[PDB]
Symmetry: C3
Subunit: 269 residues, 3 copies
């Protein structure tokens, strides 16, 4: 279906990007051989130095244009991944049945479209590129929650999916309006790690950090935004360690990482 | 399933292609350092110039072989995408139930196999590479039409899929036998845009341009083939603008693009 | 679902790898222009030669670090493909229903995790990189066998899947404990080709070569291991020719390749 279409388009970008990288390598090589030829033939030091500077200026321009093509190829790749993830979000919302979760997933399609369209307009912006990455990770976490809700029909899992899909929409409009915000950037990642864990205490704690960063970004108090980031940083690290201790380990640090997330959310509420 | 297999093989091509690009960069660097060493030590101008020309000849050969590896990596990627798309076409035809559409999808598998096998035989051919691209786009449009037909069981949608899958087969054998034909190249793309639109008037208009380009290519009248291309060019541009005005816009140009496609098909029939 | 997640991560690797390749090209170009400048200005031959050697040493280090990044990018790609293939293996085992085949598929998840984790620890090892490739191919063959078993519910196909999934686990722990073993490396590939063929005689013949290579690797008789490789080499080539003669050909060599695999397995038992 649509999955094969994206792989076909992403592969065209890789072939085209590798084609342009070789184009830059080929041009830089022509300049070197031409410079060595002129340096060995000419005797005027003034002309030799000017031939060297124009090659160094052109070589620096060749590299910059190649960084631009990689920049545009990355935004085009992130645009295809965002649309594919949003398309997966709406179909999973259909397989649930709730018209309310269908309205929530419909906004993610609108959020993914608008954020990916602005990144492709000016890929040189690093904030619009990173904000689109986290929105993609938020949609992926929402899709993983929706797919789990339709496995056994557990009413807690279905409500778990609704609360975290709506929270993903919340932690998406925030980074869309404030891409350069480190507090909103970290509270989103803490929610993605809290969605995959499935803990009710971790989901309500991550969303509270999103609202704290939202209110701190309503006004323009920089000391207020930095406090939410440090609170969201320790929460995110506690969830990543809890995921490592559950996948492997010997249950020793697994109980230790629980109190890490518990104490981190304690001083944040 | 098969989708994960293609991604695994396409990723091996990207790693291998990046490995060979660095191999060329490493060899070009060795030649530059060796040339600077010999130019600074030797005093005979005759020997210095010959050392420079053999490096420029070898550097030009290194770049050409790297363009060849990118050329072979692109054909191998297009071969994997074509087979994956044809595999998706036959299973969607099974989910419909019509044995007639199963015979139509069976030809696409044969058309995708033969076209992708000839492109991998000599990837330096640009016509066989581009003709395979449009055949892939034709199969993707056929798959999107087949998946929509099995959504609600609408009898119009199921017949809409049969007419456009057969038309995709028609606009595939044509570009296979005439890869260097611009008229057949454009009538195919007009059909792909007409399939996604779902308009009955746009589907019969695009196929009529395929038959006009087919009869013009039966004989060898070049003025006849150019007339179909210009007719298919305006039809394709009208469908792409109609898709832009339906996705966004304010319904103003949406009605304007309808008369564009209407008038374009008028002077083509 | 998970398929879109892997494509998103694999595309980030390609963009990042292309970003680092250009970084190496940009640094190598700066060294060339700086060297040409110093060679044209300075007159002391002793200083010129030392400026050349330090550039040749740095250029050789730049290329080596770029080979390392390609090395680490390949292991990260093979780790994502292995986990995605193992995830596909467990769900197909669930769709069968046998708790025994679910325990077999559960080991592949453990085998794919452990082998991919050791390859990412030291990607410079070529044996751990190649052993992970064949384990991926073994899981893919197991998934293709499991998907075919749930098509028509044929009891022979369901048992065909169980025998070859268990054999895939057998030809996975072997290459995991002996990555540098050519006999175990070839008996695995002979099984992958024997799984796709579906021949009962080819499956029991490939597994017998796995047990022969297993017992030869129990001890450390090098002449014993080389005998199994030559026996597994001819079996693998006979299955690849049998696949070519069945896909195309004119049934002439198709019967000839059958006696090839028959005689190859004859002198191996």
């Amino acid at each position: 279906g649509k999955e094969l279409e994206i792989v076909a388009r992403l592969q065209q970008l890789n072939i085209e990007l590798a084609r342009k990288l070789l184009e830059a390598v080929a041009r830089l090589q022509e300049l070197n051989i031409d410079l060595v030829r002129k340096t060995s033939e000419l005797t005027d030091e003034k002309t030799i130095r000017e031939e060297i500077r124009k090659v160094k200026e052109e070589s620096k321009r060749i590299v910059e244009e190649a960084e631009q093509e990689i920049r545009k190829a990355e935004a085009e790749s992130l645009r295809l991944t965002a649309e594919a993830a949003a398309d997966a979000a709406r179909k999973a919302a259909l397989r649930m049945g709730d018209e309310r979760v269908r309205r929530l997933a419909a906004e993610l399609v609108r959020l993914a479209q608008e954020a990916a369209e602005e990144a492709t307009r000016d890929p040189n912006s690093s904030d619009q590129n990173e904000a689109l990455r986290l929105i993609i990770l938020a949609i992926e976490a929402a899709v993983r929650a929706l797919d789990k809700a339709i496995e056994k029909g557990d009413p807690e899992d279905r409500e778990r999916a609704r609360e975290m899909v709506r929270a993903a929409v919340r932690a998406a409009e925030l980074v869309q309006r404030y891409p350069s915000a480190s507090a909103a950037n970290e509270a989103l990642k803490a929610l993605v790690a809290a969605i995959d864990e499935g803990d009710k205490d971790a989901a309500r704690c991550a969303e509270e950090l999103v609202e704290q960063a939202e209110e701190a970004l309503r006004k323009k108090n920089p000391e207020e935004a930095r406090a939410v980031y440090e609170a969201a940083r320790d929460v995110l690290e506690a969830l990543q360690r809890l995921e490592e201790a559950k996948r492997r380990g010997d249950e020793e640090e697994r109980r230790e990482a629980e109190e890490r997330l518990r104490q981190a959310c304690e001083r944040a509420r």
